[PDB]
Amino acid sequence: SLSPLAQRVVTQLSVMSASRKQPKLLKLAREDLIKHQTIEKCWSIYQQQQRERRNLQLELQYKSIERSMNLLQELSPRLFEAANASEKGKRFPMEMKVPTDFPPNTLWHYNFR
Amino acid sequence: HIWSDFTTRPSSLSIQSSKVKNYLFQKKASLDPPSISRRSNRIKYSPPEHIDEIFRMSYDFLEQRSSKFYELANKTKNPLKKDALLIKAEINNPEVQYNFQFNNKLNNVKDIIDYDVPVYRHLGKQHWESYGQMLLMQRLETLAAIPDTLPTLVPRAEVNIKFPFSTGVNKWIEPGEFLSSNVTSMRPIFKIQEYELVNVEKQLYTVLIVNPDVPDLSNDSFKTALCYGLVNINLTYNDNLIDPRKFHSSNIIADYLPPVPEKNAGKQRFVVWVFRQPLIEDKQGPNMLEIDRKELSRDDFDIRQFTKKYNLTAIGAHIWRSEWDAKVAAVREKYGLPPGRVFSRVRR
Amino acid sequence: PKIKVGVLLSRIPIIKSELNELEKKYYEYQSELEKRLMWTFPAYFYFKKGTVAEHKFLSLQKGPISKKNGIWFPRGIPDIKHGRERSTKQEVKLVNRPVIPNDRITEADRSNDMKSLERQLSRTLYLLVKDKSGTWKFPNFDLSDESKPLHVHAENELKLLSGDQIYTWSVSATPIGVLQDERNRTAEFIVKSHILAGKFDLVASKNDAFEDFAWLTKGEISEYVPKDYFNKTEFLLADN
Amino acid sequence: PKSACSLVKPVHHLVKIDKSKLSPRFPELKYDKSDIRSPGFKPKDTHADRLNDHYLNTLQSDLLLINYSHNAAVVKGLKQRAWSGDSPYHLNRPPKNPRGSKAQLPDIHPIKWSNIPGLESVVINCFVREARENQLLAITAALQLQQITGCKPHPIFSKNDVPTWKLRKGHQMGAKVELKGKEMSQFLSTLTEIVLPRIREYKGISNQSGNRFGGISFGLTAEDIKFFPEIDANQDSWPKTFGMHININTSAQLDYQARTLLSGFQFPFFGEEK
Amino acid sequence: TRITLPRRPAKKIQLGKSRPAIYHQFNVKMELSDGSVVIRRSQYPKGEIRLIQDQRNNPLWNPSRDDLVVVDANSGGSLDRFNKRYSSLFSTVELSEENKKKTQ
RNA sequence: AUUGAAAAAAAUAAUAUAUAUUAUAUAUAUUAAUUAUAAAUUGAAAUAUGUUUAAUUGAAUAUAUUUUAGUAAUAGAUAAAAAUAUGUACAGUAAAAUUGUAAGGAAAACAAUAAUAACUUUCUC
Known part of the structure; x- marks a missing residue:
């Protein structure tokens, strides 16, 4: 009837497809609808507040950098040139890694190289 | 719990039905929804899981934020800032949302939707800006009602009209709709719903209906005729249905005359215009103004000069259209007017 | 005004940050909502027909109720397609030793040991060192040579203070901020470094500086650092 | 049609208008996609993202400190060059093209708190050349992208016509998927955690790669895709596997900023920079 | 001569019914090489995996690691047969016996 | 309506019923469905009737009936590769060139490449 490759690919296409593979639409009562709206509204505000707190911290950090640069330049230009040098090829140490859900068996290392 | 107390907050910021409030504030999933009536449908319905715990914390989060806003609102003195702060404090109350989205906003009842509260005023403004204002201005634009009558309009108050006396059937008139001579044969009423903070103990309004389509065979053009004119009308946020109850014969600067089109004279547009009188300070009570009935042509009426002379600011408008039918003759004799003229079917 | 270099070391978190109560419950709510809208599992593809694993999975699962004429159903006529009710979520039940995740609370947490680098895995630790007095502060190192960049001076001086038992990274030569003092006419420059391996282990027996150290976080930095010193550095730390 | 002349009539009001909201048709597009009432609704913040958190916790402040240049100024890009006014022929002359390029280039602003190099999207391009004969193989690409990335793959069809290559225009050959947000974060993490540290001769991403203004790209061979967890588990059902292209888009103004940024997410670099 | 499966009448997803794709x-x-465990959202049906080799045991990703099991x-x-059979x-020490051929 | 929980209502819209007017309106009741449509000795699941084990009841167990499996792409008012080339309504902007990317090179596919003054909303000091 149909080649085995087509049968296999039809199944793979079936896994892609949405035919007879989705539930009924999510219907909420009028009062639960208001319930959901207030949940999202808080989450939206909460995320905005966290974002603004981070931005304000970075505002101050930059303020601190420039005041440090201004003072270093006026006092000792010898160090300022080194500080203002570019970091075009700077790379984070690969030993630093994104946090993992659960810690490793060995928490830390006291030997290097 | 600022939202729980009612020492100074209006009662309108609450769910009148107790069963609804009990479910919305239920501590455990033990009460069935009130909205779904049939018990069979009640059994079939399944609320989403873990929706009560998160709602309670979300409610607390807003509660604290509202309290901060109210405290801030207490220390201010500017009424405009005060209103903005109040709207900002309570806009997030689930009760306020339930009261507004779920109950009539046009014929609002003082218990649920009170338009004296800034929050319901703000929500009503946004709602009208979504659909009603958008539809109105399109009708006024594509029908060339604006430039013919006034340079422009900047809406600030929903306007609705009806003809309850003509036939006895209730139907709010959609702007630009086509109305027979019988339906518009007796009188219109208005519902000038305001949404902007205004001194409703001092402010006064005027209502003019104009028809800039009457043939003018002298100049081979058209001339504008005043249809209905009222001056010095008081209003209230929750009671603003202008009707013979709320005005006397002194306010009528031009008694209503029916739309009476002539045969083959083309469609005629009747544009309702609602303004507001000047607000002069340093005086107690409203600033009554005596309209000059002397000129008041009402046959060749120039709205632009009328507005300029009396310094009126337009805030809302409405429009309907009328053509000739068999009932026009009956309307003419009912109002004791000369029989209408009959024109040709072609332009030459 | 003499220039004085300070260095703030940071221990990056080793485990993911803990979630607040609002975050935990909101995420659970969304996941359940997603499961409600979740699609059918295409078991007919992963599990081939006749495979023993396939038949083991079938028994591992619980079938749905099917529509049947002449029998009433209170919650509604079943709607099953591909062997799953469409009116609610679907549950799919699933050396090869079982994966046992390690505990997120270590020994240093229960023992309340302050010197260790594991006291707070999900937070950021900063090396705060006490002076001759009880005033705890970030290490301030004084230079006079000026023949080396300030960040390099702090790095080399730190290694000799720890007995070459530390591995620190110099994030940048740009000092983070200034802690100026008018009494002694001292200008202090703070440099951001990251600890990679080893511990501090003060070993300088000449009593040149410092007596005690710690690996506190921002919450604990506040209680040990004086308020005036804390105020001028609150923004240079990491909340989580 | 009586005429073909497009001329919109001017309006007499300032109110913005949108016929979609006041047309009764399609009552469900009126709801926003994020709204619960929309059939298009899909939860977004199902769970916390560890990679994003890392960037916002540690790499955010670090990058600001790295890239900061004291009293740096905006470097204007190569824009169109105006015509000097010395002849009566410049009044309506279109402006000249940029100096060395036929396309305008953007400005480069100093890095500040608001603009810190960060990720924005990741695009997987997969062009199975062998599909020219067997179209059925292109479907396997969509499945492979689906299983690995975890998002719906948008298919790739031919656009050009090269007879030397038996290439025909208007045929399906591959699939592509746009990744954003948490799902992109998972892909980037699982790429460096699992797939990348499994190539015998792997040295890293070339420093020469990358669009001038942000954006870094590399490629995975056919055999590298076997290293993904969702193919390693079912090797029986994956007889044929084949490579793809990866493109990481970021908010970096220049490339070198992006390379420093991506290094924080455990990405190695080996070559020499420009 | 191309292998193409014929296309059936595409069903009409009329406006407003465009549901998102939420794959199971x-x-x-x-489970990493060490005890580190990361939760990953995957389609294949089985809850735990061990990674025999991963970033943990890769010299490129751990330049500072003195001890690194491979x-x-x-x-x-080798590990399979060369060891038990020999x-x-x-x-x-034995690798020093065949160290060099001492040839130019 | 019966079916585990212990007097109601005040929105738009849909459906059912009814009736006011030379007005496609109003009153009441309730919030269905929203990716489907014949055809399977064989795969999966389900309920009912018996048995054996393990009062109830878990498992297996034979039969009857039914449901799933015909596994097929667009999930976006989709937007410069292919097909519907005349009507209407809504919406969008191409192309070259450059820089990169496993096979890939001059030529296959993907990604990036002009500036935010003023305005609205939200968060924040």
């Missing part, structure tokens, strides 16, 4: 996925725990695919070869001849 499992909260699957990924393990590769176990399909057949379990008497032992050592890298």
Whole structure:
């Protein structure tokens, strides 16, 4: 009837497809609808507040950098040139890694190289 | 719990039905929804899981934020800032949302939707800006009602009209709709719903209906005729249905005359215009103004000069259209007017 | 005004940050909502027909109720397609030793040991060192040579203070901020470094500086650092 | 049609208008996609993202400190060059093209708190050349992208016509998927955690790669895709596997900023920079 | 001569019914080389995986690691057969016996 | 309506019923469905009737009936590769060139490449 490759690919296409593979639409009562709206509204505000707190911290950090640069330049230009040098090829140490859900068996290392 | 107390907050910021409030504030999933009536449908319905715990914390989060806003609102003195702060404090109350989205906003009842509260005023403004204002201005634009009558309009108050006396059937008139001579044969009423903070103990309004389509065979053009004119009308946020109850014969600067089109004279547009009188300070009570009935042509009426002379600011408008039918003759004799003229079917 | 270099070391978190109560419950709510809208599992593809694993999975699962004429159903006529009710979520039940995740609370947490680098895995630790007095502060190192960049001076001086038992990274030569003092006419420059391996282990027996150290976080930095010193550095730390 | 002349009539009001909201048709597009009432609704913040958190916790402040240049100024890009006014022929002359390029280039602003190099999207391009004969193989690409990335793959069809290559225009050959947000974060993490540290001769991403203004790209061979967890588990059902292209888009103004940024997410670099 | 499966009448997803694609996925725990475990959202139905080799045991990703155990695919070869079949001849002292050919 | 929980209502819209007017309106009741449509000795699941084990009841167990499996792409008012080339309504902007990317090179596919003054909303000091 149909080649085995087509049968296999039809199944793979079936896994892609949405035919007879989705539930009924999510219907909420009028009062639960208001319930959901207030949940999202808080989450939206909460995320905005966290974002603004981070931005304000970075505002101050930059303020601190420039005041440090201004003072270093006026006092000792010898160090300022080194500080203002570019970091075009700077790379984070690969030993630093994104946090993992659960810690490793060995928490830390006291030997290097 | 600022939202729980009612020492100074209006009662309108609450769910009148107790069963609804009990479910919305239920501590455990033990009460069935009130909205779904049939018990069979009640059994079939399944609320989403873990929706009560998160709602309670979300409610607390807003509660604290509202309290901060109210405290801030207490220390201010500017009424405009005060209103903005109040709207900002309570806009997030689930009760306020339930009261507004779920109950009539046009014929609002003082218990649920009170338009004296800034929050319901703000929500009503946004709602009208979504659909009603958008539809109105399109009708006024594509029908060339604006430039013919006034340079422009900047809406600030929903306007609705009806003809309850003509036939006895209730139907709010959609702007630009086509109305027979019988339906518009007796009188219109208005519902000038305001949404902007205004001194409703001092402010006064005027209502003019104009028809800039009457043939003018002298100049081979058209001339504008005043249809209905009222001056010095008081209003209230929750009671603003202008009707013979709320005005006397002194306010009528031009008694209503029916739309009476002539045969083959083309469609005629009747544009309702609602303004507001000047607000002069340093005086107690409203600033009554005596309209000059002397000129008041009402046959060749120039709205632009009328507005300029009396310094009126337009805030809302409405429009309907009328053509000739068999009932026009009956309307003419009912109002004791000369029989209408009959024109040709072609332009030459 | 003499220039004085300070260095703030940071221990990056080793485990993911803990979630607040609002975050935990909101995420659970969304996941359940997603499961409600979740699609059918295409078991007919992963599990081939006749495979023993396939038949083991079938028994591992619980079938749905099917529509049947002449029998009433209170919650509604079943709607099953591909062997799953469409009116609610679907549950799919699933050396090869079982994966046992390690505990997120270590020994240093229960023992309340302050010197260790594991006291707070999900937070950021900063090396705060006490002076001759009880005033705890970030290490301030004084230079006079000026023949080396300030960040390099702090790095080399730190290694000799720890007995070459530390591995620190110099994030940048740009000092983070200034802690100026008018009494002694001292200008202090703070440099951001990251600890990679080893511990501090003060070993300088000449009593040149410092007596005690710690690996506190921002919450604990506040209680040990004086308020005036804390105020001028609150923004240079990491909340989580 | 009586005429073909497009001329919109001017309006007499300032109110913005949108016929979609006041047309009764399609009552469900009126709801926003994020709204619960929309059939298009899909939860977004199902769970916390560890990679994003890392960037916002540690790499955010670090990058600001790295890239900061004291009293740096905006470097204007190569824009169109105006015509000097010395002849009566410049009044309506279109402006000249940029100096060395036929396309305008953007400005480069100093890095500040608001603009810190960060990720924005990741695009997987997969062009199975062998599909020219067997179209059925292109479907396997969509499945492979689906299983690995975890998002719906948008298919790739031919656009050009090269007879030397038996290439025909208007045929399906591959699939592509746009990744954003948490799902992109998972892909980037699982790429460096699992797939990348499994190539015998792997040295890293070339420093020469990358669009001038942000954006870094590399490629995975056919055999590298076997290293993904969702193919390693079912090797029986994956007889044929084949490579793809990866493109990481970021908010970096220049490339070198992006390379420093991506290094924080455990990405190695080996070559020499420009 | 191309192999193309014929296309059936595409069903009409009329406006407003465009539901998103939410593919079935499992909260699957990924066990690294060390005890580190990361939760990954995957489609394949089984909750735990061990990674024989991963970033943990890769020198490129851990330049500072002095001790680094190395393990590769176990399909057949040295670790499999050369060891048990030759379990008497032992050592890298023995590697110094065949160290150099001393040829120019 | 019966079916585990212990007097109601005040929105738009849909459906059912009814009736006011030379007005496609109003009153009441309730919030269905929203990716489907014949055809399977064989795969999966389900309920009912018996048995054996393990009062109830878990498992297996034979039969009857039914449901799933015909596994097929667009999930976006989709937007410069292919097909519907005349009507209407809504919406969008191409192309070259450059820089990169496993096979890939001059030529296959993907990604990036002009500036935010003023305005609205939200968060924040």
